[PDB]
Amino acid sequence: RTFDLEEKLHTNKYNANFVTFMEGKDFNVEYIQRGGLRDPLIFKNSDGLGIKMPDPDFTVNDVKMCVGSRRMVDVMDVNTQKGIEMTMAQWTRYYETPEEEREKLYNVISLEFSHTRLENMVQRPSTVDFIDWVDNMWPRHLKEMQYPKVQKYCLMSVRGCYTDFHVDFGGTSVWYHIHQGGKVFWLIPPTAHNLELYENWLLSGSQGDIFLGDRVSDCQRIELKQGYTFVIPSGWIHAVYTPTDTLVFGGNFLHSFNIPMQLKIYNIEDRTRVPNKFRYPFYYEMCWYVLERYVYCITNRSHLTKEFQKESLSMDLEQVHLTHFELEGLRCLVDKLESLPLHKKCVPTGIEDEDALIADVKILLEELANSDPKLALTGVPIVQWP
Ligand SMILES: O=C(O)CCC(=O)C(=O)O
Ligand SMILES: [Fe+2]
Numbered sequence: 001r002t003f004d005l006e007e008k009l010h011t012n013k014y015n016a017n018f019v020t021f022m023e024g025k026d027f028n029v030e031y032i033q034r035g036g037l038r039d040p041l042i043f044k045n046s047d048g049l050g051i052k053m054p055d056p057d058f059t060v061n062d063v064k065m066c067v068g069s070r071r072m073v074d075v076m077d078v079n080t081q082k083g084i085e086m087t088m089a090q091w092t093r094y095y096e097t098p099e100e101e102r103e104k105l106y107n108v109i110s111l112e113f114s115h116t117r118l119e120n121m122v123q124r125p126s127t128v129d130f131i132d133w134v135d136n137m138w139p140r141h142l143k144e145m146q147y148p149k150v151q152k153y154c155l156m157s158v159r160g161c162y163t164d165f166h167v168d169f170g171g172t173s174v175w176y177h178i179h180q181g182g183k184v185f186w187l188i189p190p191t192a193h194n195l196e197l198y199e200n201w202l203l204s205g206s207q208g209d210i211f212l213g214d215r216v217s218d219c220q221r222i223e224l225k226q227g228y229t230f231v232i233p234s235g236w237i238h239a240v241y242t243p244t245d246t247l248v249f250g251g252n253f254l255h256s257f258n259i260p261m262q263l264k265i266y267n268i269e270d271r272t273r274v275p276n277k278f279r280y281p282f283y284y285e286m287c288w289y290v291l292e293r294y295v296y297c298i299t300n301r302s303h304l305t306k307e308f309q310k311e312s313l314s315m316d317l318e319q320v321h322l323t324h325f326e327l328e329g330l331r332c333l334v335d336k337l338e339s340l341p342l343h344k345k346c347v348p349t350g351i352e353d354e355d356a357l358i359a360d361v362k363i364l365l366e367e368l369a370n371s372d373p374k375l376a377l378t379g380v381p382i383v384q385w386p
Contacts, residue, residue, distance in 0.1 A: 002209035014221035024048030030379045036257040036325040041231040050126035064092040066118035074110045078161040107161040111154040131255035137289045140386050141311040148281045157242035165212040165239040170280025171265030172252035176230040181246025186213045187220045190235030202272045235261040259329030284346035293383045295360050303357045308350035321376040
């Protein structure tokens with residue numbers, strides 16, 4: 001902590017214009033097919049989004065219950081890092097310690113609660129339910145851990161905590177709803193140039209002597225108030241600061257319209273030697289399912305084992321025009337997966353022949369090469385009914 005955060009919080013120089021303000025109603029799948037979720041969005045009203053949030057007088061304490069006290073939570077010491085020593089019990093008591101009495105500066109930005117009752121209490125925007133790689137790609141009988149359980153998040157921050165510049169794991173995109181309080185964001189776009197600066201910055205030790213926002217040409221500091229829903233696209237480098245005690249509900253997802261950046265970031269994580277602890281769980285296994293789903297949804301030719309096919313069929317019994325976004329995306333998924341050394345192709349377990357799959361994708365990618373953008377804008381993803 002060499003640079004003055006206060007300065008970075010009050011100078012009016014991060015005036016870039018990256019964020020697009022819109023109405024939740026306008027946020028549908030045709031929008032994603034049209035823009036490819038390349039812009040960070042802010043919805044002042046939750047109207048049209050299809051989200052559901054607890055009675056707003058909900059408090060951290062109300063959270064220490066639903067999840068479960070004595071339920072170890074990863075808590076970071078915004079003055080250095082880690083200290084996940086505590087559970088909700090110790091934490092809740094910390095949240096309510098008047099600022100001055102407050103000894104440490106703690107932040108909880110990892111509580112993933114889909115396990116707890118809190119789940120059916122919180123609901124993400126329906127558009128995100130349409131493109132989420134998990135709900136839509138991973139075999140459903142495996143989520144009814146052997147499935148990426150990194151979907152719903154509950155961040156709880158105190159006045160003063162600051163999360164330094166980073167790009168969310170796996171190049172995931174993220175949605176946040178400020179339930180109580182507010183947050184200040186510094187946004188930097190995944191410009192090839194910026195993404196280089198950022199990687200070199202993580203190698204030099206992410207010094208903390210340099211404010212990354214000052215290293216780039218254009219940065220936008222945004223302010224999220226109570227009630228806003230925030231969407232950050234895959235790849236963006238951002239830093240966050242909690243001006244006051246805030247409670248946020250959100251999540252990190254993967255979709256099929258910005259696959260190249262998603263892989264772009266995984267490879268940064270690979271070169272930056274990020275510990276396998278903080279890696280998106282089952283990244284490549286997921287990728288294999290994405291392809292198998294595409295081939296099956298477009299071609300009706302399944303590539304899962306008979307067993308898996310049976311479950312998918314049981315559960316149920318209870319041409320096509322792609323955007324360039326997906327065509328270029330599938331291309332990367334194919335090339336990426338092929339450049340993986342044999343022992344580490346992480347072929348999921350529900351897949352018969354990966355080669356037959358890969359062969360079928362390459363053929364699929366050439367037959368569909370000429371897709372009409374207009375005709376592609378179907379308003380609904382081709383991969384549906386997980
Ligand atoms: O609010 C914060 O401190 C960090 C938010 C977060 O989870 C992220 O930017 O990845
Ligand atoms: Fe983030």
